[PDB]
Design a protein around this ligand. Structure first.
Ligand SMILES: Nc1ncnc2c1ncn2[C@@H]1O[C@H](COP(=O)(O)OP(=O)(O)O)[C@@H](O)[C@H]1O
Ligand SMILES: Nc1ncnc2c1ncn2[C@@H]1O[C@H](COP(=O)(O)OP(=O)(O)O)[C@@H](O)[C@H]1O
Lengths: 691, 748
């Protein structure tokens, strides 16, 4: 764990580092050939992790030739973390994209494929095309999976060495593959490795979201229903190797373990992080709070320090905006209605004494360049020239160093959110890539978040410090108490979710079972041995209902057995005539003649239709019957789950009773499945030109 | 002499004069150009007409912009600027330089020293434009002001005292309103409303026409109201209702009704008391944008070739609209609308189009009405093997990167309710951008990037430029027009095509399911196709009937608003008269007479016999409302000889007498400012009372009832009637307040 894994990994980095001279003296085509060489050793039984030093040095050198970018040491480490069942926490702007090229390469080598999982189709395409040169230079192929892509193009994307696509599309492909009627219709290979780009949304927020295929035609208006379902959690759990990335904003390590058996490793930043996060400040009232904020801004901007003020609503942004104006402090508000205005304001938000106010600041952030962006500047030029640019960079170097000397970007949170990951994202907007920076959050006793101390009195004691319009002290214990209360809400919320997951696990295990069976059936061209085997189960169970085993003859319902056979097995047998003609029948030889009779009737149909046609008919029938009963069972399981309000109550766990019910329903479906297959095959009409 | 054609003919002659002035302006020093302003002002002071100044003043602005901004206005921008000097909307297409154009009218409309208000849609543009233009105009010897929310009143007065002011509609209006709550003239922050130049009139003037600006404060009557009214409630055995309800008390029952448009606040008290089972602010002041902008002596504004709404500007604001030509010929090819049986036939036709165009290297932008519709067309493009990108509103950084390459050869981009104006699509891609990954550029580097871009640029132009596919039209044609106008900007080749199907929602605008359902019979066979120009015109005419219909409905609302406006214009006119004078005594003396005459009329009927006089009603009336206890009867026992009119005189007289005493104790200046104060305050009170009671009458325009005996109109008459009653209660209450005012006399 911990530094032990990290210290061990650091030893590998020194080896990778020491290999670079050897790597720089190789030709491009020799570099290409290391992939062939890695695979030949793998073929001779080599352990993949033994190849990490050489494999990562090859990628680092290919990247410099191809991208003009050389993986940093910390990116080597992150690449190592992602080859295990691990989340790498890497800070924003640390290079997650390039880092991911490392484990992707390594885990492509055994020829089983790589699924790099993106949040949207834009990224899937962008990263596939950007990386295709790197990976072709190394003798690998790259695939792109999209919604709407024809099955042959998808098959091709999945046959590549490394594939890019969204989570949704991967999951939907799995479901549709589990509705195929021949193994050639499948688009995916075995699920080998999932490298997931942004695990907060993809693995945590979406864990229980069902992916569903829906079903126009059905059964006996005729509206549409669920044919196939899997949660995201249980899709990613089918993979042999699972890993992913997120930012240091974190707070959910214990969820990743609980939901996925994923460890999380915090990866060190390339440069030392020096952002000063100062103690949280508490004020009696919003008004005192806001005045404090105005005062901080006032002092900092006078120093030349840029500020970013994050609020929780439009109304509060307007309030702090109006008060800054009332104090004569120039600023800009990020207004969600004016996207162009916003990008233009962002661009210069790190300019000396810039003040920017943002409402529920969100996505990774567009970066804030200190001193300003100088590129927005040349971008704005219409015929930019050499001496023009260096003038521009020259004045910028000075603005940059000046903003740094002044303490870099100061972040002010005017309120904390209930989720600390949100606060962490705002504050992470400062101190990127080793830059000086600072952060401070403000609270009042009127703030909504004071309600997470589930007690007025407890909360309202804080006012006994008294605060007083200027003489503010600072108590560190408040920062920590607040962080503890956000942590408790998360814990509470998750405890509730994990009880929901334990229900989800009943469906999961059932789905895993039935899909395993289906796939066994799918992979086999001839299903005879099962048919024969299940025909005997079905005949025995059917017969038992009328001939209680080893009972006297007077308990037998030969009338009911005759019709049963007729109506379900198309089998019309003079059973009463047999008994009354052979005293020497006996039960067990009755069962045999019945079984034998259905079988020779089936053989006659087969002779008319043909063996191969028959084999394939059996297999189709088995798949189609599986599918029909499984859609039925999914709806029944659905109704049983929401019925969780009048069944298990006064000291019998409702969970334990649901599990009994669910197990009973599954076990019954599996018996129905055999019944219906044999009944279909029994009753299939065939024109006999004769007897 | 026709209309717009003739306008542009005459403006073009002026443009040729302005261009001829340019070498003269060139040769002038910077200080000489700065002096032009003072020289134009000396001319105006000696009686010159402003419009005689247009050519000189424009040559001056245009040469100042060269030297300062390094940009020289185009001839089309001179035209746009002359338009904006008139009560007109200059319609100039996206990309044409509205922001620079607007410096010309602003400069000219500043020369008379009365101020300009540039109106922006937000604070960011206000500020940016202010700062960007300060150097231009300070070069021309003028000053520039910025007005923002929260700005302190001194700062605000300075911004309005600048030559040219920038700010949002909202803040202009709110300043106005608060100026009308001032108790002294020096509290006002604005000057008289001279010229407003509105930057984007579609949102500011149309969409936002009826949006009220409201100042509220508890600034109210207290209670006792609620709780007297409470005390009926513990006998409401809920079994007719009105007579029951009426059942005595105060301020009603002399056989006066409860739902008189007059006892409206009272009735609201009971509607609230009894609806109550299942402080408050109040409006201190309100105005609409439409009625704010109508206060200005000159109004003008800009928008892009985004018309369709000309008839509403003229109807609502009396703004004419001039369509300004483009600096370069606008060659976008806007092709016949196509109509398909089914959504599915339509999409298939779209695909084939994108497919043939991208094979010849032309870029396509595909605009849809929803996310669902975007996913559909995208998936079908993927099914056809066609690469593209969707603009996903969740991924704003993705979207910016998509757009930057959206004019790239064979690029295909799908947009969901794409907005107006928006971020441009550069053909070939963006070449001063491309460098914006490039951390240390050189001689060779950009040169390269730029030449390479040229080849891409020229190849896209030769392929037809950007093609726009509208997959469905909107009900608003303005929107469709904003989408097609993404293409063919600044003289570039481009084209547009809109697609429609019988299954499309928009087919509903043809008020007959069967009349719509005819086209079916011109039955659109799959891969084949024809084009009929009458369909295109029919669709456009349908959209225009839908618009004109919604605007008939709006007009009716605006009739309601005309009542309010007329009442507020009149009371605020009375309020400002008062505010602007130190001494309101003549006003006061005049209205006490009026008040005293009429009060006496009510008991002594003019010319009456001394037995048609009621003094058991007259003297009480006096001691009650005026603190003026005159035992008149007991005079009248002594002088039977005196006569009605010289008794009215002696009545009057007294009140003056007792009031001059109150004054020689308080001080004349004190008394004078207390009187203006009483008059302002009383009018403020009654006004706010009126605003509330009308709000309540208006929401009687619901189920008090009636698509039947004309609700509106009855409303206008009850409202004007109550307004004219309020002006008389203002007079009576002022005089009551000043007659009852307590000030401690002498001693003993
Ligand atoms: N090793 C490197 N050498 C040079 N530039 C790098 C390196 N690693 C990443 N970058 C650049 O750093 C920036 C941030 O990387 P990105 O993957 O977009 O960041 P994040 O971790 O926030 O997703 C990008 O512009 C990327 O190309
Ligand atoms: N006369 C000119 N010469 C050179 N560039 C100009 C001129 N007028 C405007 N532009 C530029 O044209 C671009 C678009 O102008 P803007 O005022 O934003 O256009 P729009 O009419 O669509 O609002 C801006 O970058 C602007 O600075």
């Amino acid at each position: 764990r911990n530094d032990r894994t990290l210290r061990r990994m650091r030893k590998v980095v020194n080896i990778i580092n020491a290999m670079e001279p050897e790597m720089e003296k190789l030709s491009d085509e020799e570099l290409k050939g290391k992939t062939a060489e890695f695979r030949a050793r793998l073929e001779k039984g080599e352990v993949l992790e033994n190849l990490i030093p050489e494999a990562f040095a090859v990628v680092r050198e290919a990247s410099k030739r191809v991208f003009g970018m050389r993986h940093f040491d910390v990116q080597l480490l992150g690449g190592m973390v992602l080859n295990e069942r691990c989340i790498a926490e890497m800070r924003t702007g640390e290079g997650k994209t390039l880092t991911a090229t490392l484990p992707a390469y390594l885990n492509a080598l055994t020829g089983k494929g790589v699924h790099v999982v993106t949040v949207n189709d834009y990224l899937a395409q962008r990263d596939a095309e950007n990386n295709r040169p790197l990976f072709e230079f190394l003798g690998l192929t790259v695939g792109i999976n999209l919604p709407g892509m024809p099955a042959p193009a998808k098959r091709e994307a999945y046959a590549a060495d490394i594939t890019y696509g969204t989570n949704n599309e991967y999951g939907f492909d799995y479901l549709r593959d589990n509705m195929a009627f021949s193994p050639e219709e499948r688009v995916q290979r075995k699920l080998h490795y999932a490298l997931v780009d942004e695990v907060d949304s993809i693995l945590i927020d979406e864990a229980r979201t069902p992916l569903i295929i829906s079903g126009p035609a059905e059964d006996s208006q005729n509206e549409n229903q669920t044919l196939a379902s899997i949660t995201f959690q249980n899709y990613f759990r089918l993979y042999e190797k699972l890993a992913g990335m997120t930012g240091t904003a974190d707070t959910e390590a214990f969820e990743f373990s609980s939901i996925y058996k994923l460890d999380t490793v915090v990866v060190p930043t390339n440069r030392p992080m020096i952002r000063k996060d100062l103690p949280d400040l508490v004020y009696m009232t919003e008004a005192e709070k806001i005045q404090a904020i105005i005062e901080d801004i006032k002092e900092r901007t006078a120093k030349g320090q840029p500020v970013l003020v994050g609020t929780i609503s439009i109304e509060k942004s307007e309030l702090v905006s109006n008060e800054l104006t009332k104090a004569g402090i120039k600023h800009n508000v990020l207004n969600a209605k004016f996207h162009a205005n916003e990008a233009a304001i962002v661009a210069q938000a790190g300019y000396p004494a810039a003040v920017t106010i943002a409402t529920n600041m969100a996505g990774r952030g567009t970066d804030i360049v200190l001193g300003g962006s100088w590129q927005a500047e040349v971008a704005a030029l219409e015929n930019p020239t050499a001496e023009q640019i260096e003038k521009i960079k020259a004045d910028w170097q000075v603005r940059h160093d000046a903003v740094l000397e002044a303490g870099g970007l100061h972040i002010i949170g005017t309120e904390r959110h209930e989720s600390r990951r949100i606060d962490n994202q705002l504050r992470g907007r400062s101190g990127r890539q080793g830059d000086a920076g600072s952060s401070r959050f403000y609270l009042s006793m009127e703030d909504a978040l004071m309600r997470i101390f589930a007690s007025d009195r407890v909360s309202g004691m804080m006012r006994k410090l008294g605060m007083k319009p200027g003489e503010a002290i600072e108590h560190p214990w408040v920062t920590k108490a607040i962080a503890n209360a956000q942590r408790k809400v998360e814990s509470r919320n998750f405890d509730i979710r994990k009880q929901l997951l334990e229900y989800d696990d009943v469906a999961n295990d059932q789905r895993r079972a039935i899909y395993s069976q289906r796939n066994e059936l799918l992979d086999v061209s001839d299903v005879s041995e099962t048919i024969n085997s299940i025909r005997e189960d079905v005949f025995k169970a059917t017969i038992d209902a009328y001939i209680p085993p080893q009972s006297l003859e007077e308990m037998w319902d030969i009338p009911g057995l005759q019709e049963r056979l007729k109506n379900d097995f198309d089998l019309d047998l003079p059973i009463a005539e047999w008994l009354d003609k052979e005293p020497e029948l006996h039960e067990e030889t009755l069962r045999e003649r019945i079984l034998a009779q259905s079988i020779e009737v089936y053989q006659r149909k087969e002779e008319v239709v043909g063996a191969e046609m028959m084999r394939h008919f059996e297999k189709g029938v088995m798949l189609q019957t599986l599918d029909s009963l499984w859609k039925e069972h999914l709806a029944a399981m659905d109704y049983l789950r929401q019925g969780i309000h009048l069944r298990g109550y006064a000291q019998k766990d409702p969970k334990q009773e649901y599990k009994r019910e669910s197990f009973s329903m599954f076990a019954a479906m599996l018996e129905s499945l055999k019944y219906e297959v044999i009944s279909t095959l029994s009753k299939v009409q065939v024109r006999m030109p004769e007897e």
